[PDB]
Amino acid sequence: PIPNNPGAGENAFDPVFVNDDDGYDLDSFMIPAHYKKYLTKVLVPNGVIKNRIEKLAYDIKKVYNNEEFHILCLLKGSRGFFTALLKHLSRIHNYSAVETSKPLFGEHYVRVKSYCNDQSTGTLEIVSEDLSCLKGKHVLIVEDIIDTGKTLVKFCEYLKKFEIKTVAIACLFIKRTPLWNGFKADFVGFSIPDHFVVGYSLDYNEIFRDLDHCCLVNDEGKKKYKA
Amino acid sequence: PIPNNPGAGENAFDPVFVNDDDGYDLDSFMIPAHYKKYLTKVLVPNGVIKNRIEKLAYDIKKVYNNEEFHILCLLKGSRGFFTALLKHLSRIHNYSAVETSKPLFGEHYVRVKSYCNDQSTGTLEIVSEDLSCLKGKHVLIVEDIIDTGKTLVKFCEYLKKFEIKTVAIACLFIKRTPLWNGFKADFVGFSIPDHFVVGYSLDYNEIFRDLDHCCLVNDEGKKKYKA
Amino acid sequence: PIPNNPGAGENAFDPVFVNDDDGYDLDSFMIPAHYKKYLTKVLVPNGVIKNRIEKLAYDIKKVYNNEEFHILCLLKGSRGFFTALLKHLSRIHNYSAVETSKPLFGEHYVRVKSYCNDQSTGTLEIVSEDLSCLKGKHVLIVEDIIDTGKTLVKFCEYLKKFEIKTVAIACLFIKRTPLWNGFKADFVGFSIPDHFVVGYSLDYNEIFRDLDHCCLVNDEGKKKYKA
Amino acid sequence: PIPNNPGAGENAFDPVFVNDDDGYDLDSFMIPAHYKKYLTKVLVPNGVIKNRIEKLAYDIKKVYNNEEFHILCLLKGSRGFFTALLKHLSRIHNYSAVETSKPLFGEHYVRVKSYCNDQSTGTLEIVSEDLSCLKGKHVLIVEDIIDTGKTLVKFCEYLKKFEIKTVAIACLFIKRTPLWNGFKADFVGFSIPDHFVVGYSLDYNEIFRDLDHCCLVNDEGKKKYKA
Ligand SMILES: O=c1[nH]cnc2c([C@@H]3N[C@H](COP(=O)(O)O)[C@@H](O)[C@H]3O)c[nH]c12
Ligand SMILES: O=c1[nH]cnc2c([C@@H]3N[C@H](COP(=O)(O)O)[C@@H](O)[C@H]3O)c[nH]c12
Ligand SMILES: O=c1[nH]cnc2c([C@@H]3N[C@H](COP(=O)(O)O)[C@@H](O)[C@H]3O)c[nH]c12
Ligand SMILES: O=c1[nH]cnc2c([C@@H]3N[C@H](COP(=O)(O)O)[C@@H](O)[C@H]3O)c[nH]c12
Ligand SMILES: [Mg+2]
Ligand SMILES: [Mg+2]
Ligand SMILES: [Mg+2]
Ligand SMILES: [Mg+2]
Ligand SMILES: [Mg+2]
Ligand SMILES: [Mg+2]
Ligand SMILES: [Mg+2]
Ligand SMILES: [Mg+2]
Numbered sequence: 001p002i003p004n005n006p007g008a009g010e011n012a013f014d015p016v017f018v019n020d021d022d023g024y025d026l027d028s029f030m031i032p033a034h035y036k037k038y039l040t041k042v043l044v045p046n047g048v049i050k051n052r053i054e055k056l057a058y059d060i061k062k063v064y065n066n067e068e069f070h071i072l073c074l075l076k077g078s079r080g081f082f083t084a085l086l087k088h089l090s091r092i093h094n095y096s097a098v099e100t101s102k103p104l105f106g107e108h109y110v111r112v113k114s115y116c117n118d119q120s121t122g123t124l125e126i127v128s129e130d131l132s133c134l135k136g137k138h139v140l141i142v143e144d145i146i147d148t149g150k151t152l153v154k155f156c157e158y159l160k161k162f163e164i165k166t167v168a169i170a171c172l173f174i175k176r177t178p179l180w181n182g183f184k185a186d187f188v189g190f191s192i193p194d195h196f197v198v199g200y201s202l203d204y205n206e207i208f209r210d211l212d213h214c215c216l217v218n219d220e221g222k223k224k225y226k227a
Numbered sequence: 228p229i230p231n232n233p234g235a236g237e238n239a240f241d242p243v244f245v246n247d248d249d250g251y252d253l254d255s256f257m258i259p260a261h262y263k264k265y266l267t268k269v270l271v272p273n274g275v276i277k278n279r280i281e282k283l284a285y286d287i288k289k290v291y292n293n294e295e296f297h298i299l300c301l302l303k304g305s306r307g308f309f310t311a312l313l314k315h316l317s318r319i320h321n322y323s324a325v326e327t328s329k330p331l332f333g334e335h336y337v338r339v340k341s342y343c344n345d346q347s348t349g350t351l352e353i354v355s356e357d358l359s360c361l362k363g364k365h366v367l368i369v370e371d372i373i374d375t376g377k378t379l380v381k382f383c384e385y386l387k388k389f390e391i392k393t394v395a396i397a398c399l400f401i402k403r404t405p406l407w408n409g410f411k412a413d414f415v416g417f418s419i420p421d422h423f424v425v426g427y428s429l430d431y432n433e434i435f436r437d438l439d440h441c442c443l444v445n446d447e448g449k450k451k452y453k454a
Numbered sequence: 455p456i457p458n459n460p461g462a463g464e465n466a467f468d469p470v471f472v473n474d475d476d477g478y479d480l481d482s483f484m485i486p487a488h489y490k491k492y493l494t495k496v497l498v499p500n501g502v503i504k505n506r507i508e509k510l511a512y513d514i515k516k517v518y519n520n521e522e523f524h525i526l527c528l529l530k531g532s533r534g535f536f537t538a539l540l541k542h543l544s545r546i547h548n549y550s551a552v553e554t555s556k557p558l559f560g561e562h563y564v565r566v567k568s569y570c571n572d573q574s575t576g577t578l579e580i581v582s583e584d585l586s587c588l589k590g591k592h593v594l595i596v597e598d599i600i601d602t603g604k605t606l607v608k609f610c611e612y613l614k615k616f617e618i619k620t621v622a623i624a625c626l627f628i629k630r631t632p633l634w635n636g637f638k639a640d641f642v643g644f645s646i647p648d649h650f651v652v653g654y655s656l657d658y659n660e661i662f663r664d665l666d667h668c669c670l671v672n673d674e675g676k677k678k679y680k681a
Numbered sequence: 682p683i684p685n686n687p688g689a690g691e692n693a694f695d696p697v698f699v700n701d702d703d704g705y706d707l708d709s710f711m712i713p714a715h716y717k718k719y720l721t722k723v724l725v726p727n728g729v730i731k732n733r734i735e736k737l738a739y740d741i742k743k744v745y746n747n748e749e750f751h752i753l754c755l756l757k758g759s760r761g762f763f764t765a766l767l768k769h770l771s772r773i774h775n776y777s778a779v780e781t782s783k784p785l786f787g788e789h790y791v792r793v794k795s796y797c798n799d800q801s802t803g804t805l806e807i808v809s810e811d812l813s814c815l816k817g818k819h820v821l822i823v824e825d826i827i828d829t830g831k832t833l834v835k836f837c838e839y840l841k842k843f844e845i846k847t848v849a850i851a852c853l854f855i856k857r858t859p860l861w862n863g864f865k866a867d868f869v870g871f872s873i874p875d876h877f878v879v880g881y882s883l884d885y886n887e888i889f890r891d892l893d894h895c896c897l898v899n900d901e902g903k904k905k906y907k908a
Contacts, residue, residue: 016709028697029736032321034328047728051894055710075336083310090437094259095549101261106433109302109336111356129338129354206333210317213732243482255470256509274501278667282483322776440505486775488782529790537764544891548713555715560887563756563790565810581810583792660787664771 002064002138003168006156007149009184013059015174016052018044020193023216035211038221039198044190046212049172049200050084052189057088059187060140060170061104068104069138069166074155075111076209077144080201081172081189085142108134114151116227117205118196118217124154131162138166144202145173149183173197173214196222229294229365230395233383234376236411240286242401243279245271247420250443262438265448266425271417271441276399276427277311279416284315286414287367287397288331295331296365296393301382302338303436304371307428308399308416312369335361341378343454344432345423345444351381358389365393371429372400376410400424400441423449456521456592457622460610461603463638467513469628470506472498474647477670489665492675493652498644498668503626503654504538506643511542513641514594514624515558522558523592523620528609529565530663531598534655535626535643539596562588568605570681571659572650572671578608585616592620598656599627603637627651627668650676683745683819684849687837688830690865694740696855697733699725701874704897716892719902720879725871727893730853730881731765733870738769740868741821741851742785749785750819750847755836756792757890758825761882762853762870766823789815795832797908798886799877799898805835812843819847825883826854830864854878854895877903 003010024042073082093104111127114120146152152169159167171185177194195216198208204217205225230237251269300309320331337355341347373379379396386394398412404421422443425435431444432452457464478496527536547558564582568574600606606623613621625639631648649670652662658671659679684691705723754763774785792808795801827833833850840848852866858875876897879889885898886906
């Protein structure tokens with residue numbers, strides 16, 4: 001059935017497991033010249049993230065089938081994930097679509113903020129907006145990464161007040177940090193070591209979002225761009 | 228220099244001109260089976276839009292050079308445009324980037340609503356993170372289409388109270404409609420005939436956003452999905 | 455059923471029709487700086503060709519269903535067409551493939567030469583792996599463009615001696631030239647005006663194969679690269 | 682300088698190193714339903730191969746600069762590699778190209794064959810063709826994988842008789858097999874464990890070429906499709 005136990009990831013499929021020492025030299029891939037000095041290595045190449053997101057879209061389609069749902073994007077680190085997910089979801093649905101078929105999902109955006117440098121501020125800002133349009137709807141939250149779990153634990157709590165029919169979570173990354181609060185997604189791309197990552201829309205004080213690969217910012221980058 | 232006369236498009240390059248009778252049969256390209264009955268034809272295929280956006284990114288990079296600017300995405304219709312632009316902007320910039328280079332842009336979102344069915348309600352609703360963070364910044368507004376010109380003339384008026392350094396406009400489509408108030412973009416993709424279009428994130432009552440090509444919704448489509 | 459009347463295109467769907475004056479300014483799309491002076495304009499952008507080829511792959515899959523066939527690539531002009539076709543054929547087929555499914559096609563190459571400058575030398579030279587391996591097989595010839603029809607009428611004649619089960623033709627372009635001998639493809643992408651085109655693997659004395667868009671070489675280009 | 686010691690890989694950059702136990706579950710990525718039972722795992726995802734090929738193209742451009750050279754594709758397992766390489770090479774060259782620039786490379790194809798099942802036959806068939814056009818030219822051989830090294834050792838020997846100016850080797854994979862004869866490429870994508878791989882144009886008796894990811898065929902697939 002459709003998932004509806006936010007944070008429990010009751011029937012979640014295992015993600016790709018990135019070992020603690022997995023990764024690649026920056027010289028093995030295309031890296032913007034000026035960013036090189038601020039990264040220690042490539043963790044997950046752009047291409048593998050894209051390939052994995054395609055399977056996630058397949059997993060999602062398999063769970064919702066033809067059931068109309070609404071994708072809620074958690075801006076802005078979620079952009080890379082969201083775009084690729086929508087691309088693949090649409091092709092999968094539309095390729096199998098028949099003349100009597102109907103659209104599969106609606107799309108929504110919510111700006112959520114809590115980080116400063118490489119740490120959560122323990123507080124979450126939610127850019128207010130009437131979410132009444134989601135009342136009685138199946139919503140699929142699309143997020144970039146679960147770290148401490150505060151963003152999702154909090155946002156899901158916030159969502160409750162809108163009488164949404166069902167709440168499921170699609171997340172690109174899940175970090176193996178001792179700070180984790182236990183929040184689990186229903187669809188997860190990769191399980192990654194405890195390092196602050198940038199790239200694929202994920203940033204460090206608004207920097208590195210344009211970096212194609214998921215990389216590890218080094219101490220020099222953290223210091224150079226510290227708030 | 229960098230554009231700073233919102234609505235004047237003072238030095239805008241000419242857009243691709245889509246003739247009044249330009250278009251393609253629906254059977255010439257891939258169209259989701261269930262959407263076929265609600266479209267009269269393909270106006271601009273996905274591939275041409277992507278190719279044009281790449282050139283547009285080239286033009287923008289040429290104008291800004293290395294000057295840091297902030298892209299303002301006008302949700303929800305401009306998503307397709309926006310993501311394609313970022314992709315090309317990033318590659319073009321990063322391909323020529325040097326070790327001593329710097330990032331080129333920041334990204335922001337604002338949800339602006341005014342349409343019901345295929346007409347402007349003559350009103351405007353806004354939702355976004357505090358726009359005061361644009362003070363003293365060069366901002367590039369990324370929009371899907373200029374129709375009556377109400378959305379952009381109004382939004383640009385609202386932007387004035389935040390002491391933004393410069394305000395330029397990048398628009399995918401500009402419709403040749405007698406309703407046009409004269410607002411011109413600084414970067415425009417295509418000039419199209421007076422028809423309500425859907426696809427490439429452009430919708431008709433939230434429908435067709437997933438349609439890959441820019442098409443014309445037929446009367447049956449407008450009737451079927453009337454609000 | 456599967457086509458088997460080479461040159462008749464008995465049940466071919468109509469191609470996209472490119473009017474005699476259709477095209478775009480070179481400044482509307484990305485063009486390699488050094489090629490600009492040798493092209494008069496863009497006839498068909500890379501993106502439209504890709505979109506059309508996807509539909510063509512859809513048509514081919516629809517005709518063959520699960521019948522195993524062998525794609526014969528006519529080097530060197532059809533490379534762009536060929537690779538794009540394989541990509542789409544593979545995804546369309548594999549997306550609907552089931553556990554009990556089977557591969558859909560085999561791939562082969564034949565180099566056929568006959569042009570010098572912008573004209574057919576009226577002769578044909580062939581180079582390929584033994585074509586006897588096509589005996590009893592359904593073969594789909596993948597070609598870039600039908601001009602006079604000499605290449606395909608001749609090659610198809612040569613194929614007769616190898617007891618091929620079925621011979622069908624997939625052609626990206628078909629030129630509306632008074633020189634046409636009547637040979638028709640079973641799957642055709644575009645019908646274009648009488649002009650020598652380059653780009654998308656199509657060359658002029660080995661030049662312009664890397665040009666992304668199908669363009670018209672101007673006289674300066676033909677003169678500069680005359681053999 | 683331009684490499685010219687075929688098989689020595691004198692200044693070759695280290696490739697991406699795929700450890701003996703590296704790889705992913707077939708369920709982590711998109712795998713054609715009917716192929717699943719014939720593969721043990723995903724070795725290198727399609728996306729990482731594409732990302733790596735982009736850097737290889739960058740490495741090549743950096744070595745040849747504006748020096749005209751000729752790419753010689755070793756058909757047919759080489760297709761996937763070749764296509765992506767040409768795409769990236771052209772963009773890199775054409776993005777930095779200036780009005781006075783000129784094309785960077787010519788393209789050529791040579792069908793070479795030696796395998797039966799998962800083993801070399803110790804013999805090499807070369808589809809004859811006048812290679813005199815390469816006389817005094819810098820040629821870049823583009824091959825899919827170095828296994829025993831017989832194909833390249835032999836083909837390079839064959840090439841000598843054509844008075845080519847320079848001979849360099851670009852290879853996507855290099856297998857860590859005890860059967861290796863010592864032949865090294867000048868540009869190499871990945872170093873992989875000793876397993877017969879299929880996908881990305883690489884086959885097993887003409888099967889699996891359409892598989893997007895580089896995977897390991899299991900004993901059942903080898904038996905099922907044995908010659
Ligand atoms: O390692 C990281 N790199 C980049 N962004 C982040 C984030 C951002 N912070 C949020 C997750 O944080 P948390 O789970 O700690 O509440 C997400 O919305 C992310 O966009 C966490 N960890 C990282
Ligand atoms: O023909 C159309 N198709 C789809 N959306 C629209 C719009 C939406 N309305 C806004 C432009 O409206 P206007 O210029 O009329 O104020 C844009 O933000 C669009 O998203 C106008 N015309 C169209
Ligand atoms: O206008 C053109 N531009 C580029 N190549 C060609 C060709 C090449 N010539 C062959 C078709 O020739 P024909 O039909 O004249 O025998 C194809 O294999 C093409 O590669 C014909 N016309 C053109
Ligand atoms: O593991 C493999 N999978 C698929 N093809 C191959 C080949 C093919 N055989 C040639 C390399 O073999 P070798 O180096 O042993 O002469 C290349 O041309 C490849 O296309 C070798 N190993 C493999
Ligand atoms: Mg976030
Ligand atoms: Mg962040
Ligand atoms: Mg809008
Ligand atoms: Mg709208
Ligand atoms: Mg030809
Ligand atoms: Mg030619
Ligand atoms: Mg081979
Ligand atoms: Mg082989």
